[PDB]
């Protein structure tokens, strides 16, 4: 809320991982979690830790003179900026003027030029932020003011705030992507009625407190550099993750439970489920409160599949993510999904099929099984059906070089045992382009030119 506290001043010096815990879990029982305290103790932390080192243990102290100066410079800033005298508030609802005012005072305290930049800390110390950074900040403003009805609402690569009864108001309040135009103040009605993937057809997230904890544990950045991450920035995540995840903290945040179980993957904690439990509840979460279209918690269970070298099971997850994609329309801004389609169709596919080739040059492989060549034919089905209705392209010739390539990993007496229904396993396609081409996928010799401009056209 507003002030530190002595329940949360007894809990300093912050000497280690655990008393991090420890005031997290303190925060946790509040009505009220103090986001301004949480994340300048979090970027804090992480600013100190993000460094190689010389030295096997390490942990930078956050003594409470320096974390609570920069709470009264953050509150000093909004209090002295943001006169609530001139914005009524009728009944906890507040405007979307004052909704937008605050909004305006975060932003025009950026600086004008320019890792580790999601927190408060970055903000007060450095005046920089990213993206959903700045919509955080605006959160954590509106806390500091008694907004209590201004909320984080998130999409799987995006943020922007909701206010009002039950959330009803929306207001953009940061960017998104890099060269595109500036929709601050604007509501986000516009990029759910146009069906991206951005905007989630309104199946996004909407935060309460105990959410907003968990988005800024999420926003811990343990990278150091390109080859290097922090183990204790990781050892802290994951336990506030597993603190969150006791309270029911998780329940609605799939990404959370998809981050959770990357972390048990790295190292597994004593008693706890195991990742697969962790991955398979955050696919139920979606579906539970997002009517089943997001796509990450499907493509986090892949890469767990890819990892391990479950290949049929990762290509069914990835034909799941395409499933779930085709109901989408390929908007400007819906390029992080594209790169991810692209990278897990023309490069890490590929790579596993070429390593399941190598594999038969020597010994019940995926090649050999009907099963994955229908999972493979899904997940193109689910992307050439996501193009239809799209803006603009999706597929290209690059498409059609590895489609071509990963079609002739399977034999084609192996390929013949697979039916494709139109609109031994049984597949029924949906786009035009795949229904319109399957006679070729299942001919005996590829027409590598036929199916590349059947894929490629218009
Ligand atoms: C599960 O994949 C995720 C999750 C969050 C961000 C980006 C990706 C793609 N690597």
């Known amino acids: 809320a507003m002030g530190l506290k002595a329940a949360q001043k007894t809990l300093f010096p912050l000497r280690s991982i655990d008393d991090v815990v420890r005031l997290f879990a303190a925060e946790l029982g509040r009505e009220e979690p103090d986001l301004v305290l949480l994340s300048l103790v979090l970027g804090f932390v992480e600013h100190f830790?993000?460094?190689?080192?010389?030295?096997?243990?390490?942990?930078?102290?956050?003594?409470?003179?320096?974390?609570?100066?920069?709470?009264?410079?953050?509150?000093?800033?909004?209090?002295?900026?943001?006169?609530?005298?001139?914005?009524?508030?009728?009944?906890?609802?507040?405007?979307?003027?004052?909704?937008?005012?605050?909004?305006?005072?975060?932003?025009?305290?950026?600086?004008?030029?320019?890792?580790?930049?999601?927190?408060?800390?970055?903000?007060?110390?450095?005046?920089?932020?990213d993206s959903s950074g700045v919509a955080f900040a605006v959160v954590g403003a509106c806390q500091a003011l008694g907004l209590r009805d201004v909320h984080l609402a998130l999409?799987?690569?995006?943020?922007?705030?909701?206010?009002?009864?039950?959330?009803?108001?929306?207001?953009?309040?940061?960017?998104?992507?890099?060269?595109?135009?500036?929709?601050?103040?604007?509501?986000?009605?516009?990029?759910?009625?146009?069906?991206?993937?951005?905007?989630?057809?309104?199946?996004?997230?909407?935060?309460?407190?105990?959410?907003?904890?968990?988005?800024?544990?999420?926003?811990?950045?343990?990278?150091?550099?390109?080859?290097?991450?922090?183990?204790?920035?990781?050892?802290?995540?994951?336990?506030?993750?597993?603190?969150?995840?006791?309270?029911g903290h998780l329940e609605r945040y799939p990404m959370a439970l998809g981050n959770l179980a990357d972390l048990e993957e790295l190292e597994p904690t004593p008693g706890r489920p195991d990742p697969l439990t962790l991955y398979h509840k955050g696919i139920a979460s979606a579906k539970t409160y997002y009517r089943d279209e997001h796509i990450y918690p499907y493509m986090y269970l892949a890469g767990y599949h890819c990892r391990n070298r479950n290949v049929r099971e990762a290509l069914q997850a990835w034909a799941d993510t395409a499933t779930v994609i085709q109901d989408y329309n390929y908007c400007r801004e819906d390029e992080e999904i594209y790169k991810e389609f692209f990278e897990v169709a023309n490069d890490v596919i590929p790579n596993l099929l070429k390593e399941a080739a190598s594999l038969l040059e020597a010994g019940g492989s995926a090649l050999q099984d009907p099963e994955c060549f229908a999972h493979l034919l899904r997940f193109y089905d689910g992307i050439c059906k996501w193009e239809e209705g799209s803006p603009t392209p999706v597929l290209h010739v690059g498409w059609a070089t590895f489609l071509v390539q990963s079609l002739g990993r399977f034999e084609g007496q192996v390929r013949q045992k697979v039916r494709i229904v139109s609109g031994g396993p049984v597949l029924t396609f949906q786009s035009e382009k795949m229904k319109g081409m399957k006679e070729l996928l299942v001919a005996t010799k590829i027409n590598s030119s036929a199916i590349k401009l059947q894929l490629t056209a218009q």
């Open 155 to 247: 999409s799987e690569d995006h943020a922007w705030v909701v206010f009002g009864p039950n959330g009803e108001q929306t207001a953009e309040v940061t960017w998104h992507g890099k060269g595109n135009e500036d929709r601050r103040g604007q509501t986000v009605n516009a990029g759910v009625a146009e069906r991206s993937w951005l905007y989630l057809k309104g199946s996004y997230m909407r935060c309460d407190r105990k959410m907003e904890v968990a988005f800024m544990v999420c926003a811990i950045n343990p990278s150091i550099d390109l080859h290097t991450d922090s183990l204790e920035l990781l050892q802290l995540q994951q336990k506030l993750l597993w603190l969150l995840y006791d309270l």
């Open 49 to 129: 830790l993000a460094v190689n080192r010389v030295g096997l243990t390490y942990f930078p102290v956050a003594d409470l003179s320096i974390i609570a100066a920069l709470y009264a410079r953050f509150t000093a800033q909004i209090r002295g900026a943001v006169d609530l005298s001139l914005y009524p508030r009728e009944g906890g609802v507040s405007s979307r003027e004052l909704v937008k005012k605050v909004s305006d005072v975060i932003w025009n305290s950026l600086s004008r030029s320019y890792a580790h930049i999601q927190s408060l800390f970055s903000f007060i110390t450095g005046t920089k932020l």
